[PDB]
Design an enzyme around this catalytic site. Sequence first.
Site, mmCIF file in Angstrom:
data_model
loop_
_atom_site.group_PDB
_atom_site.id
_atom_site.type_symbol
_atom_site.label_atom_id
_atom_site.label_comp_id
_atom_site.label_asym_id
_atom_site.label_seq_id
_atom_site.Cartn_x
_atom_site.Cartn_y
_atom_site.Cartn_z
ATOM 1 N N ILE A 16 1.687 -0.987 2.887
ATOM 2 C CA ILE A 16 1.784 0.010 2.158
ATOM 3 C C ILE A 16 1.281 0.574 1.130
ATOM 4 O O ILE A 16 2.102 1.803 0.160
ATOM 5 C CB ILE A 16 3.501 0.682 3.008
ATOM 6 N N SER A 18 -0.831 -1.335 -2.734
ATOM 7 C CA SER A 18 -1.577 -2.247 -3.515
ATOM 8 C C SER A 18 -1.980 -2.222 -5.144
ATOM 9 O O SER A 18 -1.578 -1.508 -5.196
ATOM 10 C CB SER A 18 -3.265 -2.119 -2.806
ATOM 11 N N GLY A 19 -2.426 -3.044 -5.495
ATOM 12 C CA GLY A 19 -2.033 -3.496 -6.957
ATOM 13 C C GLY A 19 -3.169 -4.583 -7.096
ATOM 14 O O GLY A 19 -2.529 -5.516 -8.069
ATOM 15 N N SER A 22 -1.811 -7.530 -5.736
ATOM 16 C CA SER A 22 -0.808 -7.299 -5.486
ATOM 17 C C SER A 22 -0.676 -6.031 -3.910
ATOM 18 O O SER A 22 -1.375 -5.787 -3.946
ATOM 19 C CB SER A 22 0.350 -7.563 -5.768
ATOM 20 N N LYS A 23 0.335 -7.238 -2.602
ATOM 21 C CA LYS A 23 -0.362 -6.058 -1.686
ATOM 22 C C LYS A 23 1.406 -5.303 -0.804
ATOM 23 O O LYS A 23 1.991 -6.725 -1.162
ATOM 24 C CB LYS A 23 -0.274 -6.424 -0.769
ATOM 25 N N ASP A 132 5.651 4.240 -18.679
ATOM 26 C CA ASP A 132 4.872 4.295 -18.161
ATOM 27 C C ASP A 132 5.410 5.247 -16.957
ATOM 28 O O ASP A 132 4.512 4.495 -16.052
ATOM 29 C CB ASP A 132 4.031 3.270 -18.027
#
Length: 256
Positions: A16, A18-19, A22-23, A132
Amino acid sequence: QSMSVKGRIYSILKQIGSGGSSKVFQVLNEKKQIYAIKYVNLEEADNQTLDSYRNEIAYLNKLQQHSDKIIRLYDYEITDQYIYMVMECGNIDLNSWLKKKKSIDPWERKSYWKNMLEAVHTIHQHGIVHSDLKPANFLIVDGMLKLIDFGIANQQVGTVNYMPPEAIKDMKISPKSDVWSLGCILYYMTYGKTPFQQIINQISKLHAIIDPNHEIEFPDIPEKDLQDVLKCCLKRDPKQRISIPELLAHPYVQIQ
Ligand SMILES: CCc1cccc(CC)c1NC(=O)c1ccn2c1CCc1cnc(Nc3ccc(N4CCN(C)CC4)cc3OC)nc1-2
Ligand code: NA
């Protein structure tokens, strides 16, 4: 397939989020309760990065006590190779929810605003400025917004539409910086666009954001108090900009 976190097994339902390294997964535990697990691959992480991660985790864990408008972290497991964080599963994030939305109930809008102010106010009380904030940082869970992160760990992405003037001029950050970003979020929930979304070229957009001759339009609407909040959050001079404690006493969030 499957995952173990502190000796407890979790069935993966789907990805669900992502980065980079990382998931985020929706998962079920032994008792068939649903959670989100955030996975972070540490293989290619320098020492500063690793420390930014530990620092964000420590604040998330600490601020659990202080507000229920911060996402829940139930457990985590950290090694030299990875992090697993067992968190609250949300219905959906605010950015996606807004994108598949023609218009918004004024009551829902006001209620989401309150949640955003509460969560951001809370981090400010512990010395954290997010710097941010975007709609993607908020999670809808059971008709409530929760702040997902604190802007501390290193790294839609890199978007400039919510960035305050003083952040652009640096080349200083105060709690007022988050007020601007929140103001851009509310302005989006009000008018269906961010205040500088029209300007396609990024350098022009940056120049418009810092240019006090460039007037931000605030079309008239039924709710006058909403228009006033937007005007007060979007002052280019941070010393002229309304603060979070002031926004919490504003008639927009208090009256009726
Ligand atoms: C912007 C915040 C951030 C900063 C740095 C790193 C990450 C990890 C990518 C993140 N993102 C997160 O940690 C994310 C991203 C999504 N979630 C999280 C934290 C925990 C979490 C818990 N529940 C959810 N629920 C949820 C959110 C979006 C969806 N979506 C609905 C389906 N649609 C196609 C878009 C994605 C579905 C969800 O649950 C079914 N999402 C997250
Ligand atoms: Na972060």
